[PDB]
Amino acid sequence: SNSVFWAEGGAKVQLNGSGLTVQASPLSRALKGAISFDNLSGASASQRKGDK
Amino acid sequence: VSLSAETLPDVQAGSVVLYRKFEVGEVITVRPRANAFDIDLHIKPEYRNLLTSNSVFWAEGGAKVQLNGSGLTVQASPLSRALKGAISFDNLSGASASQRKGDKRILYASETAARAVGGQITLHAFDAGKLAVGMPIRYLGIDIGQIQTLDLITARNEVQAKAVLYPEYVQTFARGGTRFSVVTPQISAAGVEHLDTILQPYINVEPGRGNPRRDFELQEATITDSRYLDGLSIIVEAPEAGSLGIGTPVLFRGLEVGTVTGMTLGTLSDRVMIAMRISKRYQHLVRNNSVFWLASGYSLDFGLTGGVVKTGTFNQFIRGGIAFATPPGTPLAPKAQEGKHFLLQESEPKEWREWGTALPK
Amino acid sequence: VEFLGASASEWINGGIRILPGDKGEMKASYPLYANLEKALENSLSDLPTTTVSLSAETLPDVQAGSVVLYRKFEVGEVITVRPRANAFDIDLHIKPEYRNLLTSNSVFWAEGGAKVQLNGSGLTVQASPLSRALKGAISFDNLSGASASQRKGDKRILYASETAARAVGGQITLHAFDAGKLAVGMPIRYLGIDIGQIQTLDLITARNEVQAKAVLYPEYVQTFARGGTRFSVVTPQISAAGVEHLDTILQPYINVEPGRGNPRRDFELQEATITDSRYLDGLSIIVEAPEAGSLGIGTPVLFRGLEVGTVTGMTLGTLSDRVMIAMRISKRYQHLVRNNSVFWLASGYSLDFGLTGGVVKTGTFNQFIRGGIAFATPPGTPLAPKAQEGKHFLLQESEPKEWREWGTALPK
């Protein structure tokens, strides 16, 4: 019941002090998209609000 | 091979397993557990002996970025390894504790995290804004430790940071009195001191002597020299602190021969005790009957008929130093011991330049 | 796109293709090669013959099948890499026509990796051969100092960088109180020309210092490392007065001041060093002062307001009653130095305010950044002899009143 969804995917090339990270590994994220989900403790209020 | 990882750092099914960047085995599968991921990997029977009980795994990957005189160079990994994946396994000396903890070997999300083995210490800090996960801990510019965990406490108004010190330096450090200081860039009109800390901050270490503690607190300033530590640490009692601080120079005839390790108050709050360390080569310059004064800023004398002012852009106008001298005398006083207390004179002696005391050795 | 072996008609026909030569004795038996490449190479086995053997503790993106290069030209190929007890043995094949391209004195380093370098010259992409970015490239060359590298170890050792491969010559050890400004591969320069390279950084738990191993090139090993040589890590100086060094933001180096004497090969890192090397031929005199004050390394020496020398160093004598400042004067101004010469310390701004007269003047002198030392000569018909190499003067506590009206005529 307590779960949150967000949209990842998009060809992401991040440059920082740690270096360069490319986030097009699965080869389908850069073409279609990726949606990542997880379970949180405060997601009960998000589930209650809205239709779904 | 079975590994556990809370997060998956670009592994996926079918990734390449490497022993110092050489194809040894392949990742069979990744299965999501209740709160982590269990990774099953296969290795060749001929290469089963390449790993032992003390082994560490980390996730490599795509590319490396180097900023230097030639510019910004992006050296990429080979295309096959970058596309399929890269998990590299090595053997360490401190990996025995990692093997003992947990059910079995645990996959690490970074090479630094995998290499972070050894003794464990806890640092209490009043602000974690300058702290970060994976922050290096250095003594004389050499990596000797790494911060691995940052935790905030609601009850006590402080941040507890867990750090791992390498087995080669765990015995030398963490012996009580050890000072850890987060170095910050100093860009001012006087000059620039630290500029690599813009991108790669670290924690400088000043070692101490005593019984092991393994529980320290983050300081604000620390002498990044470690050359006066072998010398005498004397105390100067002053009515007021003023411009003094950590790193304040100690001057014999205008030459920096020592530094100020720290400042504190005594049992009775009537004076400020400044602990300062002098160099070994200038140790014989310290005598029992030695006069100390505070040289801070610019001091000038203007008589009723004579106006003469002089400036010398001294470092005392950034950190007000303490100068010392010795009055002349045929019987020389014995050298000061390890613990010796002097009194800070309120004014510079008038004829200290004409003394010319001969100090042997 | 390569479609070799046989065409469509050649495949539907089948058989054995014949490549004629020029002359032969019609031997009884002939070998059957797998393809045209093996037929030309005269290799019966699939793998080529092993010609080059290398040892490497770590593998810097080599893998089996990497490209071997002679100044970025395809010469041979890496056959295989085998893991030993504590290292990796790399076997490589070279062509018989190109076997003469390498000799006893040769060095190998690892280039390959998809390198996109951005700088003022522009953008350079180093994935041209299309196999370097996938497998790897190993480049080899011939050096003069590679004889020591050949002697050390069992055989030739692959280097992880071109600078590491080129780092050959004499070996020196530098003791430093802080290695934060030191790094692996740090250049060591004299007058802006690369003459050495730092190769190893080691921390000592017993002695509170860092020992850095450096390699000096054979062309400069004899000239330097002769005792008294000063190595100083240059740092950027961004202040309100101005900016002096800005390439050290990205590429720091170690400036060298050479010395004269017996060879030492064991030095210590200093803090400041005169980066001029133009006063070194001149006289190095000593000035004794009651106090140091604003003096330091690089402090100017002024004759009538013109910089004619610098301060090489400061120290204390055998008896700790005065500060001895060693300063080097220029050759062209060497005759300006006399036995009866008066030296004074010009630091900051000095003004006189009488009981009835107030006149103050400022001149934004460099003495307000580095308090200089000025000198003059009192007038006299018999001129004193010129000062020798070792001459000691005394620093006057105050500027002479009428030094401007002297006007001493100094010949040459």
Give a verbal description of the structure.
- Chain B: It is found in: Cell inner membrane.
- Chain B: Homohexamer. May interact with LetA in the inner membrane. May also interact with partners in the outer membrane.
- Chain B: This is Lipophilic envelope-spanning tunnel protein B.
- Chain B: Belongs to the PqiB family.
- Chain B: It comes from Escherichia coli (strain K12).
- It is classed as lipid transport.
- This is part of a larger assembly, with three copies of chain A.
- With 52 residues, chain A is mainly beta.
- Chain A is 12% helix and 35% strand.
- Chain A contains one helix and four strands; from the N terminus they run ββββα.
- A two-stranded antiparallel ribbon of chain A has the order 1-4. A two-stranded antiparallel sheet of chain A has the order 2-3.
- In chain A, a hairpin with a 2-residue loop joins β2 and β3.
- The longest helix of chain A is centred in the C-terminal third of the chain and has 6 residues.
- Chain A is elongated and about 40 Å long.
- At the A-B interface, β3 of A face β6 of B.
